[PDB]
Amino acid sequence: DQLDSIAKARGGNIGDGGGAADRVINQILTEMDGMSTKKNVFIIGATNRPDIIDPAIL
Amino acid sequence: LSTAILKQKNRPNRLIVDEAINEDNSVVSLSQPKMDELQLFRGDTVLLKGKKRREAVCIVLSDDTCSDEKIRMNRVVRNNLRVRLGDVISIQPCPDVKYGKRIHVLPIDDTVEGITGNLFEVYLKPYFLEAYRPIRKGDIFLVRGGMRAVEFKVVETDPSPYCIVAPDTVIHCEGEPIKREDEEESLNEVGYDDIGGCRKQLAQIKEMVELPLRHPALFKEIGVKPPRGILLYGPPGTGKTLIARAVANETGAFFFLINGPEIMSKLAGESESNLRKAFEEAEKNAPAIIFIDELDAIAPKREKTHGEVERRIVSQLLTLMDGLKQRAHVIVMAATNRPNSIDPALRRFGRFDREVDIGIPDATGRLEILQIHTKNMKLADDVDLEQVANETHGHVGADLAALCSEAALQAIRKKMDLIDLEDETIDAEVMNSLAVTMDDFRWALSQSNPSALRETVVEVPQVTWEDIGGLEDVKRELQELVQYPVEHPDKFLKFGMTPSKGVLFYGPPGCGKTLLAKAIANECQANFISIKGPELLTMWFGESEANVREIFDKARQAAPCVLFFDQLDSIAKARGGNIGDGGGAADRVINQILTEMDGMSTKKNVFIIGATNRPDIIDPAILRPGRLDQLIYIPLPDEKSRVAILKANLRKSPVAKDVDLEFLAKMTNGFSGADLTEICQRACKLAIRESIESEIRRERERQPVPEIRRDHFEEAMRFARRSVSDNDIRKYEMFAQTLQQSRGFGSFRFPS
Amino acid sequence: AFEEAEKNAPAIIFIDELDAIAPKREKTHGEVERRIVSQLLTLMDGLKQRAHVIVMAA
Ligand SMILES: Nc1ncnc2c1ncn2[C@@H]1O[C@H](COP(=O)(O)OP(=O)(O)OP(=O)(O)O)[C@@H](O)[C@H]1O
Ligand SMILES: Nc1ncnc2c1ncn2[C@@H]1O[C@H](COP(=O)(O)OP(=O)(O)O)[C@@H](O)[C@H]1O
Ligand SMILES: [Mg+2]
């Protein structure tokens, strides 16, 4: 719920919590599609403003 | 079917305790029809069972005035069975009771203080002479005689535990005198009745712990094993330890208590050694209940715990609960404030497999707690416990007990000044004069501090609806929105739709937006939490949003609670304002607020009120119905409202009849509530120098007037100015106009 | 001491330097002071309160 909070285009600000916000997105990217076998896990995201979401996630 | 254990049904043996007429300590009276139903004969001996596993033996007789559902017995048997008038007991025949060979009885110290005569001849011989009184080990009976009645405790019988005191039975009273405090502890033993407000939780715990022991053959036939783990979680002071003690006392099990911090040991291997010793002692004392206080401290998550000792403690606990060797007939209970801090392995089946939530007491629950705590105390006719329960919005059972104790102390303070204290003993008249009244309880309420929400403590401005002038429509809607869901839950259930819980106040400064909120805190019987706008924000990365979750979690726990946001524009914004707002932290706080107000969680009775000054910058998602659905515009007071504002401020201060409040309102076209109040302050402040001159004139003649005149008002109006400029006014007027234009369909009517 | 105080009712028990005999239980390197604190708790729960004796400490 409210996916736009953790999903961001990255590089939005020079300092955003020391880069932890951009680093969380990278961790999310590998979990959805990385070098591991896919399971029956369905990811549903409800966003209110989808224009700020990272293009890699979509 | 969840409350199947709480229910009871009529049975022939069940009999209501009734007052005695002529019954002594050894006989009971039963009506003839039920004696025929129970096939009991007059003069037969029967066994009576009471609460907390107390047994008594008495002779059954016939009484034509006794009800078919009632049994007559004196106060001695009632104390023996630990029951009061109206309680339920079971009666069964007690055959094969033989004549006693030797019985040992010991008197109570407080009944023999100053008694030096031979106890046997004075008390025991006349009491047992040719009476054939049936007695049981542990029985307490009172015998009249001598200068003072003396109570006795049956400590030994032959045969045991049932015997008849025959003429040839040897009766001796030598031995150590019994101590009053020890008997008082057993009398005041915590039972299921002492627990109040946890009917469903008590039901679940009963079915899990006590039901398996009572009917084990049922579990053997159904071919399953009862759960052996209990996890009680709730706010501190809620009564989890008291529930555990009551369970262990009423059920024939030994209560063993373990504290988390004291288990901790710096030495390697000592802590799990202590755990093993505790479990072995509990196994020795079976049936037993193991209770662990603060399981979260002793057993955190192993992956997140850097300390080796705590991890080894968790592993030892896991092995103790489950392993190759299965523990039998042992129940482990734990109490923790935060259940999620416990290791996930400890939440598995077979080890704390069931978790029971002990929530903050309800209004009726806290009323029941007050009734339980005040049963021993003396209560006047003036006092109403329901009023005390209503005024205790967020108090917990421990807080209620402290409140009662402090109020009794306040009664002592009331009576201390009467005594001159020079005497070693107080005169009996002052002793009888002392009593507890409602005023003591009110003083305790003023002094006491709730523990559910000691963190969110703030002074109460103490504003009343009479203080606020005008806004009659707004006053009614605010009162209805809080009172209807709580006072009439069934009305919404009948219509089948949930109530609205969102209000936003927007208007020019000084028009009473936060004044209305302060009046809500007093009149409503709901908790009130006030949040200053930027109070929740934090420098750290994820702690700004963690504060938002904590606020909404506390409000959910203390439901019904009113969550008031002052200057809501500070934390709520249109999102995407700038990239320098803490690296998107301001945007991220809004998203956390959105989920808390309306997400995938059950909606509790939490009402959110926001007082914003500039509403156009607020996020449109916040103003969506379901989060803040009612938008109320608080404008500059009109001529009718200004008269009410002037009258409201002036009711307390005496005024001259010559003053025309209506004329002031007409000239004061654009003044707000604060601007008028400034005129209120200046008028009283003016001529205060003349007030000293008046009293100085009194001193001068030895060696200005309660009502404020028309003249005082005229001077004050000279300094009066309008704080809210016309340019500011237009901004609020435009926003309210958009709402009317957005809806369309002016004067909507269904077609005929 | 407690028994003698109970005998000489009314009595006042004053324990000078209570923190000395019973420091913080967690901040201890020995079981001796821990058992001191535990026994003190047992006796404090053991007060009669019908013998009208109370304890104070500084
Ligand atoms: N309708 C009113 N009746 C009585 N007093 C009022 C009224 N409106 C305002 N006041 C007075 O205004 C003062 C403070 O007003 P208040 O703080 O409630 O204003 P507000 O509209 O919430 O403004 P802001 O958002 O700038 O804080 C108090 O002295 C209060 O008595
Ligand atoms: N449901 C309740 N009914 C009656 N008394 C209660 C209840 N809950 C708490 N109390 C009071 O709280 C006091 C002890 O609180 P305790 O149970 O030790 O808190 P915790 O649950 O945090 O251990 C007791 O004196 C008891 O009277
Ligand atoms: Mg305000």
DSSP string, B175-204: SPPBPHHHHHHHHT---GGG--S-HHHHHH
Question: Which chain B residues have a beta carbon less than 8 Å from that of A21?
Answer: 541, 583-584
| Backbone phi, psi, residue B478, to 5° | -65, -40
Start-to-end Cα distance in chain A: 15
CA dihedral B310, B311, B316, B322 (to 10 degrees): 130
What is the Cα Rg of chain C in Å?
13
Spatial separation of the C-alpha atoms in residues B31 and B40, rounded to whole Å: 11
Shortest Cα distance, chain C CAs vs residue B315, angstroms: 22
- Which ligand 1 atom minimizes the distance to the CA of B516? 18
Give the architecture (CATH level 2) of B465-633. Answer: 3-Layer(aba) Sandwich (3.40)
Spatial separation of the C-alpha atoms in residues B384 and B23, rounded to whole Å: 36
Question: Other C-beta atoms within 10 Å of B521: how many?
Answer: 20
Nearest alpha-carbon partner for B119 in B143, B139, B95: B143
Structure tokens at B285: 């004392």
Query: For residue B341, what are the contacts with CB-CB under 8 A and spacing of at least 6?
Result: B296, B300, B301
Touch criterion met for C and A (3+ Cβ pairs within 8 Å): no
CA dihedral B403, B408, B411, B415 (to 10 degrees): -150
Structure tokens at B225: 């094993």
Look at chain A and count its residues.
Answer: 58
Question: Other C-beta atoms within 10 Å of B613: how many?
Answer: 19
Does residue B594 sit in helix, strand or coil? Answer: helix
Spatial separation of the C-alpha atoms in residues C35 and C26, rounded to whole Å: 12
Nearest alpha-carbon partner for B534 in B578, B567, B506, B577: B567
For residues B294 and B336, the answer to whether their CB atoms sit within 8 Å is yes
Sign of the torsion formed by the C-alpha atoms of C37, C38, C44 and C48: negative
- Which ligand 2 atom minimizes the distance to the CA of B401? 27
Q: What approach was used to elucidate this structure?
A: cryo-EM
Nearest CA to ligand 2 atom 26: B398
On whether the B102-188 domain is CATH 3.30.499.10, my answer is no
| Backbone phi, psi, residue B235, to 5° | -65, 155
Spatial separation of the C-alpha atoms in residues A50 and A7, rounded to whole Å: 10
Starting at the earlier edge strand, list the strands of the sheet with B170-172.
B140-143, B150-156, B102-107, B170-172
Q: At what angle do helices B472-487 and B513-523 cross, to 10 degrees?
A: 30
Q: Is the CB of B515 under 6 A from ligand 1?
A: yes
CA dihedral B441, B447, B451, B453 (to 10 degrees): 110
Spatial separation of the C-alpha atoms in residues B278 and B661, rounded to whole Å: 79
Question: Which residue on chain B is closest to C50 by alpha carbon?
Answer: B181
Structure tokens at B303: 């992956």
Spatial separation of the C-alpha atoms in residues B128 and B125, rounded to whole Å: 5
* Angstrom distances, CA of residue A47 to CA of A58, B544, B582, B607: 12, 21, 21, 25
For residues B535 and B579, the answer to whether their CB atoms sit within 8 Å is no
Spatial separation of the C-alpha atoms in residues B683 and C26, rounded to whole Å: 63
Spatial separation of the C-alpha atoms in residues A9 and B155, rounded to whole Å: 82
- Overall CATH class of domain B363-447: mainly alpha
For residues B343 and B314, the answer to whether their CB atoms sit within 8 Å is yes
Shortest Cα distance, chain A CAs vs residue B597, angstroms: 13
Ligand lying closest to the C-alpha of residue B647: 1
* Angstrom distances, CA of residue B360 to CA of B48, B234, B457, B472, B529: 38, 8, 17, 35, 16
Spatial separation of the C-alpha atoms in residues B690 and A16, rounded to whole Å: 63
Structure tokens at B148: 């003072």
Which alpha helices (DSSP H) does B582-725 contain, by range? 585-597, 639-650, 661-667, 673-685, 688-702, 710-719
Spatial separation of the C-alpha atoms in residues B732 and B615, rounded to whole Å: 8
Spatial separation of the C-alpha atoms in residues B300 and B314, rounded to whole Å: 7
Shortest Cα distance, chain B CAs vs residue C13, angstroms: 20
Does residue B16 sit in helix, strand or coil? Answer: strand
Sign of the torsion formed by the C-alpha atoms of B222, B224, B228 and B230: negative
Q: What is the DSSP letter of C40?
A: H
Look at chain B and count its residues.
Answer: 752
Beta pairing class for B102-107 and B170-172: parallel
Ligand lying closest to the C-alpha of residue B360: 2
Question: Which chain B residues have a beta carbon less than 8 Å from that of A47?
Answer: none
On whether the B192-357 domain is CATH 3.30.70.330, my answer is no
Structure tokens at B54: 């107390």
For residues B250 and B198, the answer to whether their CB atoms sit within 8 Å is no
What is the Cα Rg of chain A in Å?
12
In the 3-class helix/strand/coil scheme, how is B20-79 assigned residue by residue? Answer: CCCCCCCEEEECHHHHHHHCCCCCCEEEEEECCCEEEEEEEEECCCCCCCEEECCHHHHH
Spatial separation of the C-alpha atoms in residues B258 and B297, rounded to whole Å: 12
- Residue B440 CB-half CA count within 13 A: 22
* Cα-based angle B709, B710, B712 (whole degrees, multiple of 5): 70
Question: Which chain A residues have a beta carbon less than 8 Å from that of B576?
Answer: 49, 52
Asked if residue B461 has a cis previous peptide bond (ω within 30° of 0), the answer is no
Structure tokens at B77: 């048997």
Question: Cβ–Cβ of A48/B621 closer than 8 Å?
Answer: yes
Query: For residue A9, what are the contacts with CB-CB under 8 A and spacing of at least 6?
Result: A52, A53, A54, A55
Q: Is the CB of B677 under 6 A from ligand 1?
A: yes
Interface of A with B in 1-58 (CB under 8 A): 1-2, 4-5, 8, 12-13, 15-18, 20-21, 48-49, 52
The residues lining ligand 2, judged by C-beta closer than 6 Å to any ligand atom, are B 194-198, 236-242, 369, 372, 397-398, 401
Is B191 marked within a binding site? Answer: no
Spatial separation of the C-alpha atoms in residues C32 and C35, rounded to whole Å: 5
**Identity at B122, one-letter amino acid code:** V
Distance of CA B350 to the CA centre of its chain: 32
- For residue B732, report the distance from its CA to the centre of ligand 2, in Å: 52
Spatial separation of the C-alpha atoms in residues B184 and B418, rounded to whole Å: 31
Spatial separation of the C-alpha atoms in residues B542 and B591, rounded to whole Å: 13
For residues B558 and B453, the answer to whether their CB atoms sit within 8 Å is yes
Same-fold call for B102-188 versus B363-447 = no
For residues B301 and B261, the answer to whether their CB atoms sit within 8 Å is no
Put simply, whether B621 touches A (Cβ < 8 Å) is yes
Does residue B232 sit in helix, strand or coil? Answer: strand
| Backbone phi, psi, residue B432, to 5° | -75, -30
Structure tokens at B354: 């069931």
Domain ranges of chain B: 102-188, 192-357, 363-447, 465-633, 639-728
| Backbone phi, psi, residue B89, to 5° | -125, 170
Query: For residue B180, what are the contacts with CB-CB under 8 A and spacing of at least 6?
Result: B108, B109, B110, C50
Beta pairing class for B561-566 and C11-15: unpaired
Q: What is the DSSP letter of B353?
A: -
Q: What is the DSSP letter of B135?
A: E
Neighbour-count burial of B369, counting CB atoms closer than 10 A to its CB (0-12 exposed, 13-18 middle, 19+ buried):
buried
- For residue B297, report the distance from its CA to the centre of ligand 2, in Å: 21
Spatial separation of the C-alpha atoms in residues B637 and B639, rounded to whole Å: 7
- Residue B235 CB-half CA count within 13 A: 21
User: What does this entry list as its resolution, in Å?
Assistant: 3.0
Out of 3.40.140.10, 6.10.20.150, 3.40.50.300, 3.40.309.10, the CATH code matching B639-728 is 6.10.20.150
Interface mutation vs chain B, best among A1, A8, A16, A25, most B CBs within 10 Å? A16
Q: Is the CB of B668 under 6 A from ligand 1?
A: no
For residues B97 and B163, the answer to whether their CB atoms sit within 8 Å is yes
Is B239 marked within a binding site? Answer: yes
